[PDB]
């Protein structure tokens, strides 16, 4: 019954809250990858910093959904942020493969939310997803795929020299 | 039969003209609010200037529809701009409540136009509304709602000190 | 068995992981307060932004513990970040009271960790807490206490004008 | 019987002199590593310069203890600076392993000195060690550990290409 609410279905409000949680979950998974690559027995600092940046970007995605919810007159409802699926991430290839799957999971949830918004005839929510989320996902999925191709080319997981070279030439210094 | 016309339904052309009129109507209502708050026996100049700015923005919305109509090969058809519903606006709370309802009326018309454009399979018109109109409405509706909440907190309509404080701290100097 | 590990007790490593979780929990609680004050029916934007900033600072506290853990040769172990205790925060006074208690809870955990580090004769961990955490807590606790005193002076919770004045004069614009 | 002396135990004064000697010993060992990597039949100049810098930093650590001794009213007593344990350092991996052990030996001596200062209730000496020495050690130990992990990844000692790559991408140009 918010005074600002107009053309905003309860189902979409709830799905936005669930999407918010998933963004926070993604942030936390990336934070775990950062910490792993920062370990003294892993020590791939450019890879670590790549994942730290990914983590911060996911938190920005989450905060943008909070703001959106309030703009439409919905109510933010938070749930636990589940810990990541793994405590250690193997190596750069395994981590990038997990990152690819994570970004595709997030993308599928965004696409599902777009379908719901379409079904409920909510063009503002459609526009928001298209303008602020969907292209970011396609771009990041492509970037991570490109990385995986190069890690395989470099002989991961077996080729430690390849892994070193990737950290020194493929990710930001 | 315009040489530029392509995928532009007569119904959408007509609805764009009606939307243009509504934007002009909204501009005129805001102009009335400006004049009211500029009265010597009302004298809330920051509130007055807020509504003057709202009025100018609505005229910009109208002109953008005129340009759009011509870009698609439709023909601008003007009708009378009806005078506002009231000659005096009571106080800042009453005016903001009327502004909220006005912005929601405009928003509903834009949403209805988007539905029509969708029905007629006009993605250019959909994009135009989503990119140039729908988010502006959500933003302004939220801003005015926020103002109303604060005016109520400040004890409007009875609390004149509250009304003074709002004009001096909530709206641009 | 990390090659860098020296004078770092398993108990301290575990307690650092638990402290990390608590920092993340604090961040999430502050994020909830931000979202609440950003609601159209609450609409205290300077208060909202204060809590958003608090939330970001807690995430910085968490990341610093992750880095610390790795520097000492411990291993970051993550757990679920529990959702905040409340879904809505009442008003500025109730939220500030909850913030005070949260900062004191965090402070007690830091003091307990310092006691453990002292018991295990770990001066590096003692220094880290004293140089990076303990004074921040005292400062923030004092700031929030000062705010609460002023909110009470301004007649919270009943005095809406007082609450408005606080948002406009006590917290950053 | 120095006029400035206050709360400075004879045991701490003596231990500071022994610590000074150890800093000088560490400097000399690093100087030997510099000279080794500068050999025409070793020729890893970035590695050589890394160790030269390490050597200079250890001399700075020593001089700071001399100044400290005098500030407290103790008397600097010098002993021979023993030559390093080896005349040649094998390769980058062997040298980094020796550097890690050296930094941990220095760290243990600093921790032992902190324990003594604690036992003698000398908070100024505790603060000095915590503020000027202990974090430097943790940082350098982590850095060298990280290097060792990367040298192993690069196939040291057998992989000469790996050793070349490390010198060109892991240590300052
Ligand atoms: Cl609705
Ligand atoms: Cl929900
Ligand atoms: Cl996984
Ligand atoms: Cl695992
Ligand atoms: Cl996933
Ligand atoms: Cl959905
Ligand atoms: Cl995007
Ligand atoms: Cl691109
Ligand atoms: Cl690439
Ligand atoms: Cl046509
Ligand atoms: Cl018409
Ligand atoms: Cl009216
Ligand atoms: Cl009237
Ligand atoms: Cl209306
Ligand atoms: Cl229509
Ligand atoms: Cl817009
Ligand atoms: Cl906005
Ligand atoms: Cl406001
Ligand atoms: Cl240990
Ligand atoms: Cl743990
Ligand atoms: Cl609570
Ligand atoms: Cl609640
Ligand atoms: Cl608490
Ligand atoms: Cl503890
Ligand atoms: Cl601090
Ligand atoms: Cl202070
Ligand atoms: Cl204050
Ligand atoms: Cl005032
Ligand atoms: Cl003395
Ligand atoms: Cl001596
Ligand atoms: Cl040796
Ligand atoms: Cl030798
Ligand atoms: Cl040694
Ligand atoms: Cl000692
Ligand atoms: Cl230090
Ligand atoms: Cl560091
Ligand atoms: Cl490294
Ligand atoms: Fe980025
Ligand atoms: Fe995301
Ligand atoms: Fe992402
Ligand atoms: Fe990205
Ligand atoms: Fe404006
Ligand atoms: Fe308009
Ligand atoms: Fe408008
Ligand atoms: Fe506007
Ligand atoms: Fe701050
Ligand atoms: Fe904290
Ligand atoms: Fe805090
Ligand atoms: Fe703070
Ligand atoms: Fe004032
Ligand atoms: Fe240096
Ligand atoms: Fe040293
Ligand atoms: Fe050193
Ligand atoms: Fe150093
Ligand atoms: Mg209401
Ligand atoms: Mg609902
Ligand atoms: Mg979920
Ligand atoms: Mg679980
Ligand atoms: Mg569309
Ligand atoms: Mg679009
Ligand atoms: Mg785009
Ligand atoms: Mg690319
Ligand atoms: Mg013609
Ligand atoms: Mg027609
Ligand atoms: Mg009309
Ligand atoms: Mg009439
Ligand atoms: Mg837009
Ligand atoms: Mg605002
Ligand atoms: Mg090992
Ligand atoms: Mg343990
Ligand atoms: Mg806990
Ligand atoms: Mg629970
Ligand atoms: Mg301090
Ligand atoms: Mg103060
Ligand atoms: Mg004398
Ligand atoms: Mg003596
Ligand atoms: Mg000695
Ligand atoms: Mg000898
Ligand atoms: Mg320090
Ligand atoms: Mg490093």
UniProtKB/Swiss-Prot annotation, chains A, B, C, D:
Catalysed reactions listed for this entry: 4 Fe(2+) + O2 + 4 H(+) = 4 Fe(3+) + 2 H2O
Subunit composition and interactions: Oligomer of 24 subunits. The functional molecule is roughly spherical and contains a central cavity into which the polymeric mineral iron core is deposited.
One GO CC term, this protein: cytoplasm
Protein name: Ferritin, middle subunit
Pfam entry (one): Ferritin
Source organism of the structure: Aquarana catesbeiana
Class of enzymatic activity (EC top level): oxidoreductase
E.C. numbers: 1.16.3.1
Positions of Fe cation 2 binding: 58, 103, 137, 140
Family the UniProt entry places it in: Belongs to the ferritin family.
InterPro entries: Ferritin, Ferritin-like, Ferritin-like_diiron, Ferritin-like_SF, Ferritin_CS, Ferritin_DPS_dom
Any GO molecular function: ferrous iron binding
Residue ranges of every copy of the Ferritin-like diiron domain listed in the record: 6-155
Described function: Stores iron in a soluble, non-toxic, readily available form. Important for iron homeostasis. Has ferroxidase activity. Iron is taken up in the ferrous form and deposited as ferric hydroxides after oxidation.
PANTHER family, per the entry: FERRITIN
Residues engaged in binding Fe cation 1: 23, 58, 61
Keywords on record: Iron, Iron storage, Metal-binding, Oxidoreductase
A GO BP entry: iron ion transport
Other known facts: There are three types of ferritin subunits in amphibia: L, M and H chains. M and H chains are fast mineralizing; the L chain is very slow mineralizing.
């Amino acid at each position: 019954v918010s005074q600002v609410r107009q053309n905003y279905h309860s189902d979409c409000e709830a799905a936005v809250n669930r999407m918010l949680n998933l963004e926070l979950y993604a942030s936390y998974t990336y934070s775990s990858m950062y910490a792993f690559f920062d370990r003294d027995d892993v020590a791939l600092h450019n890879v670590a910093e790549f994942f730290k940046e990914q983590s911060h970007e996911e938190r920005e995605h989450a905060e943008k959904f909070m703001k959106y919810q309030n703009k439409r007159g919905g109510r933010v409802v938070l749930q636990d942020i589940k810990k990541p699926e793994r405590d250690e991430w193997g190596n750069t290839l395994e981590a990038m493969q997990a990152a690819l799957q994570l970004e595709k999971t997030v993308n599928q949830a965004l696409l599902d939310l777009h379908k719901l918004a379409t079904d409920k005839v909510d063009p503002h929510l459609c526009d928001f997803l298209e303008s602020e989320y969907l292209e970011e996902q396609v771009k990041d999925i492509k970037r991570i795929g490109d990385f995986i191709t190069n890690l395989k080319r470099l002989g991961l997981p077996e080729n430690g020299m390849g892994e070193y070279l990737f950290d020194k030439h493929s990710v930001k210094e």
